[PDB]
Ligand binder design. Structure first.
Ligand SMILES: O=C(O)CCC(=O)N1CCc2ccccc21
Ligand SMILES: *[C@@H]1O[C@H](CO)[C@@H](O)[C@H](O)[C@H]1NC(C)=O
Length: 355
């Protein structure tokens, strides 16, 4: 119970219901490395589905019931046994309470039942942490899992631009996007967008952006232009526009991807080919991503799981690959790879996949 809650001092930066957003912090005195982790957990995109989320997923929409501490797990653990990579870093967990894939910039008001302030929550956390030691940082790693991994892709360059404009050009901003690299592919079975369950991600994100006043990275926005900013929520389209170094972690057969593809798991030929094609398409999108870790498993999320050290690609674990990435950011390194993408074509053809 080692990260302590701080509600934002700027109480106009809020969770969906107007309660203050916040962050959990465990400082490491004398470390100059800061890890800011974005939680995930889907999204909502209209009044009716946000109301239902408010009933049964309220911690993702409000801080009113948040506990005063959380235990750091995985990459947020302070024990080297659990976190070989960054156990001595300053650790920040930012709860996801904006339901907008960390993209929103709209307040609750007479016109809006809910606030969607994900993009502003990240900016405000950064600004308040500067006074608590982040001003001395050498590396700020913005990490995130699930929708928080997409949030890294949408926000890492804005954090860099914010620190530059605040006069901290020496802080190196980097991103670690876990399980947020999705494909706008054909669904295995097809449903027109007539309610929440039938609405595919491209259409739900298109509606979400309008409902949230969602914002995307400027270079990506300039490519796709107005009405088409939903494209920037898809990693393979937004990543080439980014300037900050980003390490991408993605299971090849991601469970949330399969869910949005209407796949629910004795597999017959059509579904077999669908699954194999998904893994091939994911692998293809990572071909030119130099820092990546993509095991052939059916799962979702990795970096805050306590057993995150167990999975390996080509005999290299994720904490090792991240360490090699750090070294690369000081020509490739002998025996210390950073591009690790499985080539085998079926879930759990990698023996180290989670059980
Ligand atoms: O991982 C999560 O928390 C749930 C799934 C999620 O968030 N999805 C899946 C499809 C998609 C496209 C763009 C942005 C986000 C998402
Ligand atoms: C509070 O946050 C809002 C929204 O991001 C911002 O416009 C405003 O400048 C902030 N105020 C202070 C005092 O930080």
């Amino acid at each position: 119970e080692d990260l302590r809650l701080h509600l934002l001092l700027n109480t106009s930066v809020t969770c969906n219901d107007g309660s203050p957003a916040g962050y959990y912090l465990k400082e490491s005195r004398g470390s100059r490395r800061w890890l800011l982790f974005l939680e995930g957990g889907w999204y909502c995109f209209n009044r009716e589905n946000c109301d239902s989320r408010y009933d049964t997923m309220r911690r993702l929409m409000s801080s009113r019931d948040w506990p005063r501490t959380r235990t750091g797990t995985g990459i947020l653990s302070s024990q080297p046994e659990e976190n070989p990579y960054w156990w001595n870093a300053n650790m920040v967990f930012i709860p996801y309470c904006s339901s907008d894939v960390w993209s929103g910039a709209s307040s609750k008001s007479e016109k809006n039942e809910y606030a969607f302030m994900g993009a502003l929550i990240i900016q405000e956390v950064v600004r308040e942490l500067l006074g608590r030691g982040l001003s001395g940082a050498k590396v700020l790693l913005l990490a995130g899992s699930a929708a928080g991994g997409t949030g890294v892709l949408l926000n890492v360059d804005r954090v860099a631009e914010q620190l530059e404009k605040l006069g901290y050009p020496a802080i190196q901003v980097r991103g670690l996007a876990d399980s947020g690299w999705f494909l706008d592919n054909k669904q295995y079975r097809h449903t027109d967008c007539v309610d929440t369950i039938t609405c595919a991600p491209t259409e739900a994100i298109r509606r979400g952006i309008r409902y949230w006043n969602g914002v995307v990275p400027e270079r990506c926005r300039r490519q796709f232009q107005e009405g088409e900013e939903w494209n920037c929520f898809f990693g393979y389209k937004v990543y080439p526009t980014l300037r900050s170094p980003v390490f991408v972690v993605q299971w090849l057969f991601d469970e949330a991807q399969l869910t949005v593809d209407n796949v629910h798991l004795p597999v017959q030929e059509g579904l077999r080919l669908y699954i194999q094609n998904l893994g091939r398409e994911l692998r293809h999108t990572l071909k030119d991503v130099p820092a990546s870790f993509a095991p052939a498993c059916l799962s979702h999320e990795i970096i805050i799981r306590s057993h995150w050290t167990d999975v390996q690609v080509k005999g290299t674990s994720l904490p090792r690959a991240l360490h090699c990435w750090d070294r690369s950011l000081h020509t490739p390194l002998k025996g210390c790879p950073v591009h690790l993408v499985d080539s085998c074509p079926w879930p759990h053809c990698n023996p180290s996949c989670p059980t």
